[PDB]
Amino acid sequence: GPELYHYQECVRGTTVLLKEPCPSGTYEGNSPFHPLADNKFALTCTSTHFAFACADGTRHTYQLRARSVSPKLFIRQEEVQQELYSR
């Protein structure tokens, strides 16, 4: 099916409350999955990427953009780099 790549930005260390895109879906990732109230899943805001495969077949990929203590940085190579142009 289609691959709907999504991204979410959160400060590195906190807990995101990602709204469940589709009922009864497959959580694809190494990150923790925690079904929260009102169809959500709590995740540690960090630089990772997971995916949500819905019963429809829709693949909703999910990038997590950990905003460090300095969410600007720009230390020679963008904010942090190696998460963008690492080749």
Dump the DSSP string for the chain.
--B--EEEEEETTSEEEEE-SSSS-EEESSS---EETTTEEEEE--SEEEEEE-TTS-EEEEEEEEE-SSS----SSSSS-SSS---
| Method of determination used here | NMR
Other Cβ atoms less than 10 A from the Cβ of 78: the count is 12
The one-letter amino acid at 71? P
The one-letter amino acid at 9? E
- As a whole number of angstroms, the distance between CA 50 and CA 62 comes to 5
- As a whole number of angstroms, the distance between CA 17 and CA 20 comes to 9
Determine the Cα angle at 44 with ends 43 and 50, to 5°: 60
- As a whole number of angstroms, the distance between CA 53 and CA 21 comes to 9
Q: What are the structural domains of the chain?
A: 1-67 (2.60.40.1550)
